[PDB]
Design a protein around this ligand. Structure first.
Ligand SMILES: Nc1nc2c(ncn2[C@@H]2O[C@H](COP(=O)(O)OP(=O)(O)O)[C@@H](O)[C@H]2O)c(=O)[nH]1
Ligand SMILES: [Mg+2]
Lengths: 166, 320
């Protein structure tokens, strides 16, 4: 059957792990557990199509760059995650976007922009400027919350379509 | 200009409250790395590494409202740590790691545990065994190097624990985690996945080696955090005996790694010439002058300082 190699990227502590596990395991993980590189498989059905997600979850820390290159090369689609209460994570999004472009030799790579932690009141990054940045890239933007599961199944499924339309 | 000529500026950078450095940390973004190299050399020169790193980390902590995110993102503080540790804890990494890593390279016994990543008629029980033995061998080497961390770096970890205690008194677990996130997450495990960071190796890992390093660093990271595998990936479940039997050996390490409360200063930096870095720091002020004016507009303790900064920056602008 059809496999999709999705890759989840973003700064440390933004909620890539939390996103992936709420998808894989159907619950919220609230505990300290920084990632190195965890990998999950899960066969699902999106729009009638039976398919298999090979999801890679990565480490966001600048120390783990260069180790970035290998998983990018094999990846098919990229969730680029930041936190709406952490603006600095938002500005980091650019660097992942440019690196992903470099390693694969292209400018229109299957990408989705995910803004995580929207359940929070203390939000410093507005929905609009995230939507603006998304359009200027040519890729969708989805607001999710791993705590509540809003937009989660959306955000991953959207990436799949975005791979199919490429 | 003559180093003499930066004096008035040089003595505003070093002020204990560290007000300027925080401001800079807000203003930069793409100069983060560059700026770090410049601040560290300045502070290493008049032996204030501790003043800088200790206060800066304390600021990040006092500004953190949720604990499970502490020092996870890429601030200046976490870059300042990064570049400092790469400078002072190289030998440490060679001691703990060099032997265990080189053995892993020359090996051909695969450590794969993942029910899908597995070759045909590959024995996953043989694999588990071999991995565990490496892990045991390695972490024994890691644990018995607690004393190998330079004294001054240990002090700053002590700084880190002093902080987390003043901030979260009711939480006893943080004092170890907060150290683990640097010595493991941001030092040991990276050096495991990529041995050229510290120049342990000079060669590209084989496909089997590359896998084992992830499998090993993943395992070390779980222990370093104190989490059993179980709730995440399924295949990793049989590496837990190791975690359970070393769980406490880790808590010792992380706790006592910061067990220096007196500042060290021997092997002190000889008096030479700073101008090159003071120029380059001033140049980062020029480049962010406007932005620092916006921050100086906000009244408060840093204000008078931030006022004087732009004056000094502009006055040194003119004098060149
Ligand atoms: N409120 C809230 N917290 C979240 C959300 N996603 C993650 N977190 C928390 O943020 C921290 C880091 O999550 P994690 O996924 O491990 O980060 P990552 O792996 O470094 O991207 C943990 O304390 C999570 O429980 C979310 O949507 N909402
Ligand atoms: Mg994670």
């Amino acid at each position: 059957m059809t496999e999709y190699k999705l890759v989840v990227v973003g700064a440390g502590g933004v909620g890539k792990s939390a996103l992936t596990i709420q998808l894989i395991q159907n619950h919220f993980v609230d505990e300290y557990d920084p990632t190195i590189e965890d990998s999950y498989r899960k066969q699902v059905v999106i729009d009638g199509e039976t398919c298999l997600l090979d999801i890679l979850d990565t480490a966001g820390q600048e120390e783990y760059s260069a180790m970035r290159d290998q998983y990018m090369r094999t990846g098919e689609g990229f969730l680029c995650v930041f936190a709406i209460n952490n603006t600095k994570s938002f500005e980091d999004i650019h660097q992942y976007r440019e690196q992903i472009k470099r390693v694969k030799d292209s400018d229109d790579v299957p990408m989705v922009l995910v803004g995580n932690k929207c359940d929070l009141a203390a939000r410093t990054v507005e929905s609009r400027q995230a939507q603006d940045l998304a359009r200027s890239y040519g890729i969708p933007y989805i607001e999710t919350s791993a705590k509540t599961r809003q937009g989660v199944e959306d955000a991953f499924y959207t990436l799949v379509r975005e791979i199919r339309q490429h | 200009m003559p180093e003499e000529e930066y004096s008035e500026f040089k003595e505003l950078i070093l002020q204990k409250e560290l007000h300027v450095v925080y401001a800079l940390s807000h203003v930069c973004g793409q100069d983060r790395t560059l700026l770090a190299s410049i601040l560290l050399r300045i502070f290493l020169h008049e032996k204030l590494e501790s003043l800088l790193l200790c206060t800066l980390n304390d600021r990040e902590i006092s500004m953190e409202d949720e604990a499970t995110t502490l020092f996870r993102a890429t601030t200046l503080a976490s870059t300042l740590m990064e570049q400092y540790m790469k400078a002072t804890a190289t030998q440490f990494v060679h001691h703990a790691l060099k032997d265990s890593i080189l053995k892993i390279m020359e090996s051909k016994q695969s450590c794969e545990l993942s029910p899908s990543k597995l070759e045909k008629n590959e024995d996953v029980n043989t694999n588990l065994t071999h991995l565990l033995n490496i892990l045991s061998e390695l972490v024994e080497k890691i644990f018995m190097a607690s004393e190998i961390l330079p004294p001054t770096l240990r002090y700053i970890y002590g700084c880190l624990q002093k902080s987390v205690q003043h901030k979260w008194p009711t939480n006893t677990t943080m004092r170890t985690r907060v150290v683990s996130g640097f010595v493991f997450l941001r030092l040991i495990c990276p050096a495991i996945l990529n041995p050229r960071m510290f120049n342990i190796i000079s060669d590209s890992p084989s496909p089997i080696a590359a896998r084992t390093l992830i499998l090993v660093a993943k395992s070390v990271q779980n222990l370093a955090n104190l989490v059993e595998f179980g709730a995440k990936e399924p295949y990793m479940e049989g590496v837990n005996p190791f975690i359970k039997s070393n769980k406490h050996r880790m808590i010792m390490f992380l706790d006592e790694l910061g067990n220096v409360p007196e500042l060290p200063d021997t092997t002190e930096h000889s008096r030479t010439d700073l101008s090159r870095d003071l120029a380059a720091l001033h140049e980062i002020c020029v480049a962010h002058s406007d932005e620092l004016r916006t921050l100086s507009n906000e009244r408060g303790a840093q204000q008078h300082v931030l006022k004087k900064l732009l004056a000094i920056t502009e006055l040194l602008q003119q004098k060149q």
